[PDB]
């Protein structure tokens, strides 16, 4: 039933009586549901020890992986390109897939084409796919390029991009002029991370493998600037807002901000901003190439070195203080560009937070998830601000990132409780806040379950989620932050101690119980 | 517009395609004739995409475990395979569920063998036996698992339906093999098909000799409702107020006990024909169980719908069928006495799977407002012989539409409102049309029955009539 | 006791058994206490509407008041300014207060002097302590400029400030050049936006009444812009940069974001920024003169219009889309420049915004307070929303405002229930969201003693405070934030969005009762 | 470092002061010396502040609405003028208390008169009138009303007592006209002698008459603790372990009735004697309860303060003060085991009210720290007299600093830790020097009694030793 002037959407409505009765009916009724005191009795023993130590003996299971598969990295290594389309060689139900996962994240459109190869396929390639894909997609989207990857299916059975490509241009259904760089991500190795690093290397090759011998390094007086997965908006914005405050020359390889962030006034864009062609072919003559998440982007890294001879910096990701400082004091003596007063003072305010904040960050517990980069930076600025990360989950990390974490977590005295974990899964990470609870979690969306789990437990075991990273579903605009430089250490300490305060307010709340220390100022 | 003109933009919309994809493309595009009533004589449908024109289609998995296999609550389903599909796909569609997640509810958590390369180079078989020990130590509350294959899977020649055989013995447990790989048919459509065999196969028959269950003259089954934001339970209250016995919903809020039980019922009521026509026409044929397709969206057909199904028991049923449809009389006038007015006469488009396009036209006319336009992703033939019926004189329907058509018809139709997924809302509020997510209902509903009709029309008026729209264009230009 | 290695503050200390037996003695031994059953009575009797009756007749006493008195403004306008100190003529109590609260408010140090009238000078005036407060503050703080307001004493026993000023450079106490701006602040009389109004209408007619003879209209090609009583950071810098990307000529009148928010870097810098003298001289050459916050800018008005000659443009405050809309081509009519593609972008980025989220927002019932300008503007925006803003209250609003403010919910579907009050307090506040419950309240922290009353009634009646405006004492950093402009209603616009997302998500985290519409996806 | 240096330091600082303001402030800057025993020959204190310093100081009605009558958590309390005096103090400090708050408890409300110019010009009286009789429609519960005059009400020449007598009587209730608007006296001091007067003349005798309460050989009363964080908690569970009955707590968590029950204890225990010595000599002459000063700051003053408090009993008393110390020693032994190494040898300058810059000193020590600088808003010097017995040798002392005093001292004495106000606390950060606030003990606390050193050394470590204070300066600066 519904009261037209107050209608109920499924919460609240299930829980009126009527539905209420009718649910019991059919649980007692037809589902041979386990006895409730069963279910309690499984749920606390699957946050005992116990538990944990067969939930980590697992080899062959996962449940609730932290990562992706490669082709989703280079859908949007794509994006970031002037008018291109991305376009995944092989079968269509993966596109779908892409699109979502990015359309839920960003509220935006993700423009991506597949060429649908089917069973007839498998048994004689999908060459005549990639010929029709290629011609109809530039006919009907117009894209002045075509980036290629290759879903699993493809990768299984062998195509040979390279050729496939070749001969359509061969037969006349693209124009040989026209750039379709091209790489193989097959979804089995590594993860959505190493896909962005191969197709951007794949369309670095495109534009300079074959044209070296007129290249001079230093030439353009610029220092180019490979962002990595990047899904934070305000991430691309500061990098080149703090470049352009230094005066410094930059080309940003792979730029999707324009058209992840389109107006809304009356027309769709398809294709927005996104590095040009040209900075492609010219970025062999920049002074150098800044990598700003280097875990993750190995290969670009050797032919940037190898074929460009660029000598990339040994920086990490620009997050927090230090890291902040180490990016803008290289960029500094590349450039030969002084840092202006207005980053001087940007680090200053950022300092002047963390005193400000620092009574109530300190010895705070946090468990925390993500891609390498992006971990290993929240575990640097978290040792800054006087937390302790106690558990580090990088699901797609590897023994070599591993040792440099547990060396940043050992030159602080705030890394003495921490471990880092790679190859785990988010159920792994459930055991270890339930058995060794931490204050907090850091994480993307996926983590709402864990919290979920706790409260099950308990308010006291409660483990409330702070939504830092990739995908954020539930909640809205959180892909404006920023995480990066000053800025995004500034916005994260904010949501951090913010967190602690509200988490306090609740707390505290009961009248006549707890609300002694609900205190007006904190 | 006239049927000239939509005809007119048609050819005006396929000039831009290459020789190839424009003659397959017209064959998919048709403007409704009430002197045609076979689809067969005037459009095409479950074909292959044609490459590189951005389909909004999905694979053969999404159909199965997306959309078959996932909702079955007590069931632990494998993403077999690389990591990916099963993260893509997990907690994305709203089949809602009760249970206790992670002890004996599973729905919203993603199983995954996470093939790595050396899984393709020796196989797979091995894994997933392994994998299979592991979930029995960490899941024991699990009634039953389903292995949904991905792509490599067929590809590499493993062979799950013997390690299924092999570990369901050893175990005494029902572990259901799923040749649902993304590369085979042409959409989700041949999931549905792949997956409902399965239960046949591997399900079904389980309890075929059993005779413990106590049946009544009164026993149905939901079949094809996946309770999207609780669809299904709005849909049971009312046919359990009617006096009948919902003994299995297929497959929202599914136990693998109530598939079992469903050839006990006396009738089983069809909901989605496209994705469990197949299983019906099974029941049919080997236990004598009719069924019969009937529609919930929007009180017109809910009432329509009740007075069939009472039609097909007794007397004290069809009277029961009258106390519910004059119980609820009230408020669905209600509903349409505050929103009718405000959304009389708007026009909409729509595009979805394989039954929304055609089934919840009768809402939006019990609303007042007219569908322009409507196509699926994947539906077959008998789907468009039973939309034309539906659909207006001189409507556009249109058959696996491309992102360039869905944009292109729309900038000439100017709908009020468009109706349909993920992928394409946010093209077309950018072009300043309100647009509803007519597959998760933009994370509201239920929108079956009477109660889900409030939801529904509260829903169309506030995007409808939402001041947003009134300010796309800048005051300077 | 205490754990060494779990060290507990108050909460949760004085849980332990031990504390909680002593309290229970405390209370039973001495306290004669009245019995729970009669407070949960009297309780209960407090959120009824015959007891809202009875508020409402309130005409002598305020409870919980949402405003405070006209120095505080004097002192926040004089820190705008540049090296200028602020000097509040009167009782020394009050400055340390003033100090505190815009303390608490900014974690930043707030200068301001005393001359420390006591019991003396209440019966012979305070002429000696101004001829020496002058001089000591002048030699050992060394501003450029002393601004001078009143404590409510100096107002009652009537010190003539410009006549003290005026002696204590005749008899040499401060150089007859040194600028000693002056106004009359009585606390007895509208609220702090009052003082600073008088404050600014005192400085500006220091600087230029005498001096108009050679003032010529338009002639510097600027604008000026009069922000009034502003406690956000984020609307001094979202007004300039917007001027500044449309090649606006501009002078801000009152500029204090530098010397709160100075760089944490070693050095404590008592002054940084603020508009300097010259621009306040030459600011009659300007174009026109816009005011930011009209309806706390009556006197400075006055005084533009009739001394400066400027036709000040009747404009709402820049918040939300059609008020920032107008102001924009407001000053694009008056500056002569384009609205830049730049701006045109950031707006469609905000309608892209709302486009994205009107599903969540649509409907929501809102009590909100604050100062008249911010109130109107948030309620513009929330009806720009969809939402429904039930209960508005202006503590210190008027008749002539209530009456605007009604207009602008008449012209909206969406303000058919909403009534506005003035001269209330937060104590009728709180029995407007018994009575009439509303979704959330939008309020300073104030409002956190609102949603613990209406959570001790019962979670369903909790109405959960989102904290907008000043003071914000309980969480940290906020007064970085924006509230003007198209990035101050998508900062508002994110907040709101997520503070509905999160309650949805703590109503539906409950295992197997209502976590069925505990959707990954939002 | 030395007394020669401190001292030019002194002169130096006063070289920007005007002639007379220079000579003032000269008498209220001075050097600790062991052989110099009375602060009435070495230095000035309790005067009026110079005009235009920045003096940190508040007012009388701050001493009395915010610090004596305020904390009372039954009563209500008007702020009794225009609205900004009760806004800036509303909930600023954190007096600590059990109640339902608008119900039976009222602290962290600001009930006001809210003066207009209208009251300014016909008074204030009949308004007052009114205001009661709507606190007692709308609060019933409440068990008593004071009236905290603000700086108008004796400007111009309202009558509050009148209407206090006139509407008590009517009523039947307590209703306490306070005279301390905020031009009286210099500082918050004298607001706290004119509220005890207040508390004496309308609330301390109302049960002179009665002989009901059943009294103990171990009744006590908490005198001038506030219950800052729960302070007066922390203090208390000690007493009632040592087998005292602790009747009243003044006026932290503190009701009425207790108040109107403590001239029936056997001893007054003053923490704060700053603001409390009024009523507690009065209760010694008018009852004859003996008095005495104790301090909770740390475990060696709680330990001497236990058995100098248990020495006034009988043997059981002393028996159980020493139960009570060997309970808690492996406690506050774990403490300074983990803290006192990570504090050793640092250096401490406070700047405070009334009292903690004497009393906080012991609990610096018992973490090897040293305060080589202390001073006060508003003492008297009596308290310095007790500061000189607590500080060390050549130690700088200074009553009233101002602004640019304390900067400059703190410039030259480069201090690891800085204890202060919130006035005092961003300019400090901002500098590079680890700060606690030593009045609202930054939202921490309690540091009251063995409970309260281990948040209190916990604290001083996590500021003093946070690695924010290594990052002030950009490494291309630097
Ligand atoms: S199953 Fe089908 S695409 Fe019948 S695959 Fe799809 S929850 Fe659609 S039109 Mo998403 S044939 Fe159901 C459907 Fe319809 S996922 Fe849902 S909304 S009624
Ligand atoms: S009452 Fe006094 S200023 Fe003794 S007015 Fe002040 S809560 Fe201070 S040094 Mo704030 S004489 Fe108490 C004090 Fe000390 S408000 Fe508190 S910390 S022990
Ligand atoms: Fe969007
Ligand atoms: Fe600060």
Chains 1, 3 share one sequence.
């Not at chain 1, 003596?333 to 207005?342: K, R, V």
């Not at chain 1, 913010?498 to 707390?507: C, F, G, V």
């Not at chain 2, 009430?34 to 490459?51: D, E, F, G, L």
């Not at chain 2, 949904?148 to 050893?170: F, M, R, T, Y």
Request: with cysteine.
């Amino acid at each position: 039933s519904q009261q037209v002037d107050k209608i109920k959407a499924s919460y609240p409505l299930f829980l009126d009586q009527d539905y209420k009765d009718m649910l019991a009916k059919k649980r007692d009724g037809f589902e041979e549901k386990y006895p409730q005191d069963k279910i309690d009795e499984v749920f606390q023993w699957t946050t005992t020890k116990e538990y944990q130590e067969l939930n980590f003996q697992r080899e062959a299971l996962t449940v609730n992986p932290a990562k992706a598969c490669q082709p989703l990295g280079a859908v949007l290594c794509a994006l970031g390109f002037e008018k291109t389309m991305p376009y995944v060689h092989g079968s269509q139900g993966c596109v779908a897939y892409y699109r979502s996962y990015f359309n839920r994240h960003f509220r935006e459109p993700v423009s991506c084409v597949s060429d649908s190869m089917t069973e007839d396929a498998a048994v004689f390639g999908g060459q005549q796919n990639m010929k029709d894909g290629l011609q109809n997609c530039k006919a009907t989207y117009k894209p002045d390029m075509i980036a290629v990857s290759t879903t699993c299916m493809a990768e299984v059975i062998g195509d040979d991009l390279n050729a496939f490509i070749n001969n359509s241009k061969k037969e006349g259904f693209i124009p040989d002029e026209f750039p379709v760089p091209f790489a193989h991500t097959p979804a089995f190795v590594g993860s959505h991370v190493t896909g962005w690093d191969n197709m951007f290397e794949g369309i670095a090759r495109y534009f300079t493998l074959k044209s070296m011998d007129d290249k001079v390094v230093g030439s353009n007086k610029k220092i180019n600037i490979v962002p990595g997965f990047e899904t934070y908006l305000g991430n691309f914005r500061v990098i080149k807002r703090m470049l352009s405050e230094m005066g410094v020359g930059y080309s940003l390889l792979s730029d999707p901000e324009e058209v992840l962030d389109t107006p809304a006034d009356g027309q769709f864009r398809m294709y927005a901003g996104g590095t040009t062609q040209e900075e492609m072919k010219d970025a062999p003559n920049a002074l150098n190439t800044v990598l700003l998440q280097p875990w993750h982007l190995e290969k670009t890294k050797k032919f940037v070195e190898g074929t460009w001879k660029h000598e990339v910096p040994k920086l990490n990701i620009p997050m927090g203080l230090d890291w902040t400082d180490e990016f803008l004091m290289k960029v500094s003596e590349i450039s030969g560009q002084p840092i202006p007063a207005s980053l001087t003072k940007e680090r200053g305010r950022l300092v002047d937070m963390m005193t400000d904040s620092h009574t109530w960050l300190h010895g705070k517990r946090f468990a925390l998830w993500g891609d390498p980069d992006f971990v290993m930076g929240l575990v640097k600025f978290l040792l800054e601000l006087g937390c302790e990360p106690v558990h580090i989950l990088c699901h797609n990390g590897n023994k070599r990132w591993k040792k440099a974490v547990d060396a940043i977590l050992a030159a602080s005295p705030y890394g003495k409780n921490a471990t880092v974990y790679i190859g785990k899964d988010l159920w792994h990470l459930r055991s270890l806040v339930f058995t060794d609870k931490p204050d907090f979690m850091i994480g993307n969306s996926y983590g709402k379950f864990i919290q979920r789990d706790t409260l099950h437990k308990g308010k006291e075991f409660e483990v409330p989620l702070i939504r830092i990273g990739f995908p954020i579903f539930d909640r809205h605009h959180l892909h404006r932050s920023t995480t990066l430089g000053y800025e995004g250490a500034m916005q994260i300490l904010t949501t951090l101690v913010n967190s602690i305060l509200e988490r306090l307010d609740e707390e505290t709340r009961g009248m006549q119980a707890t609300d002694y220390n609900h205190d007006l100022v904190r | 517009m006239s049927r000239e003109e939509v005809e007119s933009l048609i050819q005006e919309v396929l000039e831009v395609y290459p020789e190839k994809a424009r003659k397959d493309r017209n064959k998919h595009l048709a403007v409704n004739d009430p002197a045609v009533t076979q689809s067969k004589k005037c459009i095409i449908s479950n074909k292959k995409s044609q490459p590189g024109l951005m389909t909004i289609r999905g694979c053969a998995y999404a159909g199965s475990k997306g959309v078959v296999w996932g909702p079955i609550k007590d069931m632990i389903h494998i993403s077999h395979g690389p990591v990916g599909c099963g993260q893509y796909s997990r907690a994305g569609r709203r089949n809602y569920y009760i249970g206790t997640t992670g002890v004996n509810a599973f729905v919203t958590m993603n199983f995954t063998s996470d093939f790595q390369e050396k899984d393709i180079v020796f196989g797979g078989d091995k894994k997933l036996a392994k994998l299979i020990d592991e979930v029995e130590t960490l899941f024991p509350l699990n009634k039953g698992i389903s292995v949904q294959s991905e792509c490599p899977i067929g590809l590499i020649g493993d062979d799950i339906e013997s390690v299924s055989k092999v570990k369901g013995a050893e175990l005494s447990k029902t572990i259901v093999p799923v040749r649902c790989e993304g590369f085979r048919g042409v959409s989700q459509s041949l999931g549905h098909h792949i997956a409902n065999d399965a239960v046949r196969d591997w399900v079904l028959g389980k309890r075929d000799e059993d005779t413990t269950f106590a049946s009544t003259p009164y026993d149905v089954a939901i079949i094809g409702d996946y309770n999207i934001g609780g669809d299904a339970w709005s849909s049971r209250i009312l046919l359990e107020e009617m006096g009948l016995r919902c003994v299995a919903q297929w497959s929202g809020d599914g136990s693998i006990s109530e598939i079992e039980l469903t050839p006990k019922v006396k009738l089983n009521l069809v909901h989605c024909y496209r994705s469990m026509n197949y299983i019906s026409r099974h029941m049919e044929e080997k236990y004598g169980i009719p069924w019969m397709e009937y529609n919930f969206f929007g009180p017109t057909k809910t009432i329509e719908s009740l007075r069939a199904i009472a039609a097909k028991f007794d007397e004290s049923i069809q009277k029961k069928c009258e106390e519910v449809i004059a119980k609820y009389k009230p408020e669905w006038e209600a509903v349409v006495a505050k929103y009718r007015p405000r959304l009389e006469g708007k026009r909409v488009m729509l595009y979805i799977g394989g039954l929304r396009p055609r089934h919840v036209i009768g809402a939006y006319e019990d609303l007042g407002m007219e569908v322009v336009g409507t196509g699926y992703e994947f539906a077959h033939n008998d789907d468009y012989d039973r939309t034309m019926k539906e659909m207006g004189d001189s409507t556009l329907l249109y058959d696996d539409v491309t992102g360039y058509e869905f944009e292109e018809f729309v900038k000439r139709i100017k709908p009020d409102l468009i109706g349909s997924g993920i992928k394409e809302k946010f093209i077309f509020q950018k072009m300043g049309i309100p647009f509803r997510e007519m597959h998760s209902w933009d994370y509201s509903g239920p929108y079956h029955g009477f109660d889900g009709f409030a939801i529904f029309a509260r829903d169309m008026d506030m995007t409808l009539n939402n001041p947003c729209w009134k300010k796309l264009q800048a005051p300077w230009e």
